[PDB]
Symmetry: D3
Amino acid sequence: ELYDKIQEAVAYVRSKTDFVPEVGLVLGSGLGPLADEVEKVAEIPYGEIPHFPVSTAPGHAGRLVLGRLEGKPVLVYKGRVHYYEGYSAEEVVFPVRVGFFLGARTFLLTSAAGGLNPRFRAGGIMLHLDYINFAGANPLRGPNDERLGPRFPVMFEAYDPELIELARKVARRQDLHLFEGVYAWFMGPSFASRAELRLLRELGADAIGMSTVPEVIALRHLGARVLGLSTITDMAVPEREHHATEEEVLRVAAETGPVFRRYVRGILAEL
Amino acid sequence: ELYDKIQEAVAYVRSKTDFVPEVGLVLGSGLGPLADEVEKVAEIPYGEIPHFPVSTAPGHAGRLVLGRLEGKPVLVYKGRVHYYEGYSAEEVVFPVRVGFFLGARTFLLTSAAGGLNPRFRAGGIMLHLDYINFAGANPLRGPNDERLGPRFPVMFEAYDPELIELARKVARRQDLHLFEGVYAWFMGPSFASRAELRLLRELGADAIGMSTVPEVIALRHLGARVLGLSTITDMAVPEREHHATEEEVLRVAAETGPVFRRYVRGILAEL
Amino acid sequence: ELYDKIQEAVAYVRSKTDFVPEVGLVLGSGLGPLADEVEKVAEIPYGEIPHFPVSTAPGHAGRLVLGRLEGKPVLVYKGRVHYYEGYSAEEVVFPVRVGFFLGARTFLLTSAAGGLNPRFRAGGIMLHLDYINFAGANPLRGPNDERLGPRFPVMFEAYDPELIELARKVARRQDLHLFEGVYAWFMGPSFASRAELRLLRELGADAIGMSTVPEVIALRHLGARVLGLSTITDMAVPEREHHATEEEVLRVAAETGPVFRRYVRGILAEL
Amino acid sequence: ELYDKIQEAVAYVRSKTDFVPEVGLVLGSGLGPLADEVEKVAEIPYGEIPHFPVSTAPGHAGRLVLGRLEGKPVLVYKGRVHYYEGYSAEEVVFPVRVGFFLGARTFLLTSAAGGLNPRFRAGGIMLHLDYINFAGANPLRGPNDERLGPRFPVMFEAYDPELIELARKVARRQDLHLFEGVYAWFMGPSFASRAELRLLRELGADAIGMSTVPEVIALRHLGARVLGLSTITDMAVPEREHHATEEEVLRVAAETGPVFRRYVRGILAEL
Amino acid sequence: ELYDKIQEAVAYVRSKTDFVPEVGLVLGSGLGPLADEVEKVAEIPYGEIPHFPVSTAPGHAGRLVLGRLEGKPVLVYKGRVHYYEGYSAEEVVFPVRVGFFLGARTFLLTSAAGGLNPRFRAGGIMLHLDYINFAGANPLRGPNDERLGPRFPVMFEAYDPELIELARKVARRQDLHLFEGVYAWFMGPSFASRAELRLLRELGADAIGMSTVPEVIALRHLGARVLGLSTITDMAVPEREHHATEEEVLRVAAETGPVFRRYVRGILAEL
Amino acid sequence: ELYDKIQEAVAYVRSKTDFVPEVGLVLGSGLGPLADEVEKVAEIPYGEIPHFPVSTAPGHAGRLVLGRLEGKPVLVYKGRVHYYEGYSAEEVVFPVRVGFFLGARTFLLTSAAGGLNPRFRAGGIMLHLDYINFAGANPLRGPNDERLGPRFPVMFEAYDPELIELARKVARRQDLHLFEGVYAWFMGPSFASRAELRLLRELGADAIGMSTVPEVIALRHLGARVLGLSTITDMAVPEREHHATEEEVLRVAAETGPVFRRYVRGILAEL
């Protein structure tokens, strides 16, 4: 019963704290240490929350954190879940749906992603301007509940245009080159073949990852404002020799952490 | 029980009427009203027919109509079901399969669609020349009953070439400018991102919608002849602001209706 | 149970024969007759092995052959299964997983494919350099077992680079012109529309088929070496009349058969 | 001396007749017999006109015909020159420049072209919606005279929207299927390689020929109205055997002549 | 004579002043005003220098200015010449070649360009990352004088990488959002058709212009560092209505003027 | 005079030797040493032959060598000329025209070329299947002589289908992996930008060079058979760092020379 399921998840959260978040922060693979810099009021493992799917993927701690970061009330997702784990597109989006109903109307979706655009560099940061779904799944498939949003949500300006100008302004202020581009959702969990990376780039994709797009679609359905940022942990260009390993991706996510944390806190401060 | 399921459904319709149709006609979003112009012999809602999926989408009454239109004996589907509503590709094509076995060996599939081709105009009509499946689902997936058709149907000339010439002749006759092109099945129910629209145009799609292709594949499996028409309700071009909403799609499908019913009737009269 | 299932299938094969295979050979549509040229020690219907999926498709016998071919101890799959038959990607790759655990560390994946590359010919043989997954399913989706392989297996050099050089050297020795290209997995079982073929060629696909890719991903997850070969049974280029029929794929696979069998035996001899 | 050059050519033609045309008509390779149907007042070979280039190319008589066709005062060019003859883009567009100053404010440019769009047929007629210059030559390169046109003429709607709607109407009126597309100017005089046809089609060309674009560019500089028609004499599609020879192009241009000559008359009637 | 020609022009400038520039700055259509802001020590009309071509184009003064700007010895080209004016590639680049031999080892190449990337804005500045020659002419065609540079100069890193990092650093310092992309050289002087604008975007051009590339090749021949900056004077995207008019390109180039001059000086400060 | 010019050159070669060649062999950048293995009857510098252009490009001797090689009467051109040197398309193809009228009806055109196809390797040899002309010049442009060939020569099968099958036969025999693909003629003499390489690859080119295509067109006009071979001296892949240098292209041509000469002599042996 999607809705009675959300309000159950909501009621269990309010049984631990009455803290109202304004800003949802989803932290991707290796990006979790930013939950530590929060001024904490409550911390809830996903496994205790009704109908929440649990993190199985490396670099995802599976913890909901509530409190103050850079003076904004925030719901931090230390970890997410992914379609490649065996979760449906619907099950993947249950956490940010709960966050929206807890009071979060602005969401920052962060990820570790591969760079398709050869002008990018590993350790770089990319602003999501738009997405492509190459995963063959959609979280809104099935009956629509009008209390969430419409049957056919408009996905133009999926990434909030005011939030991109803010991203840029902060990047400039911090003397940070900010990459911008299109994020492709690839189901995984096998990495892309050379011909798949070639195909996604030629179709207009600048970064490649296994997350984010279902949360974007689900949040726009609800009327939330969305900001997408990936740590470019590796160059996935088929005409170079090496594809990064899981170990290497999580290492560059950790190495890029300080600049990434300082950037996100700088966006939060101005929101 | 598939085939035995079909005969269960055929038999239930024959329990209401021995009327044998020559022509199937599926009316899509906001195209239902042509069904009111039919000299009814039977009018069965989908919910009452064994194994029939019921319509939940806006502008789909979900009523099977047997009768006379432009002097032809016709099976009219007042609305249809979609993959986005959470029916399998197989469940989506149950109706047109029953339609075939009632005796409709020629089918006109109609839909509301976005224009990808920038040359097209809102309010215009696009004859289907070919299709692209970007939904990742196929109604034939599963065991094949040789009684319906072959294991590996050929989808060359999926859109009947004689019916395409006819569709052109009738447009000329009615001083009507008939757009032509390739229909892309996008799974939905979220509308395409800018980058997804660009991606589908550049693969050679001229129109985008969320129906018809499973019907086309199911019906060529059976050896039926197929003609596809979309009302280009909106212009889906990503280097222009604003995608149409649900309200705007259905509004243009009602405005265009007199031009469109006059066209469908024109074709019916020559069959 | 996955792993426990593998081990029951393994245990059942060891109840008929203690023969340890080193090379796995998968025979696709109309390519079974190579299995008869094996010096048999055991032959086992798929239907009798625990958790094995059974071949339902034309020109797939559904039998596991262990023994000696051209000197090598071989596990020969006389037929495979396809996603189009109703089987999940996981179910499709259960056989090669079982083969790996019997000791086959090198795998030959054969198939009947359509030529997209207009420079190809019916009766041709294409060495696989890479793959494109257009079927929207991955056999590793779900929980991962470290006893099989890692969470995120790298799919660069999916088709082993030394077996590619071996396959060229043998084609040269035999005076056989070996075509080379990218195999696209299309889900089927409907053949592809003209526009879908144009779509696949322009994405970088040189051949189209309904098999192989899930096996490649599954086998690279395990760390097996993979050589892919396709009989180009038909030319599937959309700007020419007539796509091939099931009967025209099976006929050419058999006419081209002696040359194919001599070629595969050459590769085996040099392993 | 560009303009003085034009006025010298104006002078010499007015020396022979004071008749003022309203409509320019340029007959391409094999389309010349329409000049025979004119009601003549004067017939001047291009040789006798100061500063005119001369037709060396097969099926171009090289003669300026003035008079009356389907009730209209027309300047009819029975042949043109092309860039592949050795003439610069400036020399090519000299006749239609003189034609404008004789008072032709509306031009029909005809041509025999190859079909790049695989949905076209030999003996079809194509309406120019737009053009691509792949010839590396612009007729306006050099010093600009404002008495002719601006320095930088805008080439949107190079082909007149109203004369496009008109062309469609008459094609509907005559029960004639009217193909529509983009014209690519290829320098020649060698025909395009297979790879060149492929590249031109991929770049959005629907037709290839060795004329017409420079006339278009120069006339829109003058502020004239242009309608483009090619007789599609051959299917130039690179994954089919045989490119049309010179003998085959000029033959089908004459076999299609009746319908083409009826159609161009239809358009004249309505100006 | 080329080199003797260069020395003849070097001679004639050294006869008016013994000033030695370090930095060459070429001002495109409507960017000329920046010259007036220079602390003159000399000013020389192009018409008066040996072998110099003369600016005929709207918004090009045609004057060589020497002196001081933001504390750098600069050589400012108030205007340039273009291939569309009638000048050969080699003629077009003589000016920047003469500057190089005067001791300007670093050039900034400013231009008024259309925006092909639909994410740009009329009034934006684009940093050149790379170029595409579509004009069908190369300045180095003909004999090669080793005293200028090599027969086959490598065009990788044509736009200097340190100067790109510096363009970004300055943009960030000045809270200026800096567009980045590939400048396509279209010959003109006709603005591109819609299908041409489409062709050049699909080929990976971000901006279209009529200048700059010849100068880029010529300067890299000599070993000069090169920084490219365009004013996006208009959006050149073919699925919108109206191309910019000559009058509109010059207006927006003057309106962006103050920001463009603050930005250029910002860079000169740091060199 | 073109023809009277051919016959003066012919007459002058006949004033040194009456030796009649069947096979023409153009040796490109660094490939000249194959001339030294000819059993010479005569050796004529280009400088002394009426109307012959002279080689100014590095690694081109500029010497006509008549003689016997691998049992065939050959006209070996030790060096060629290039559009980039200042020669017109017409001037560039004079040598092969003189060759054809001397009696050479089969031509091997060899070249040093860049690899666009990333699977190619430096030091490898690529057979020409077809060509793309990106240079903007055609050798047949101007008046046509009917004694040379037709006005509009067909360029399909420009590269002889039987000589391609022979090329593959000899490569297999010699245990030589033979790359195959499309040769792009880029005018030069500057090397291509990163974006120009990407562009030429996406349009369907596998190699890039500054020669050959003019000689192919000129020779197909005359009705000669043409085999194209390129030594892939450098990998020109825009997403790799560093483009080869001239010095480096000539070195890899020298290094590949033994394998290349064993190969060409092998093709000659079976002609």
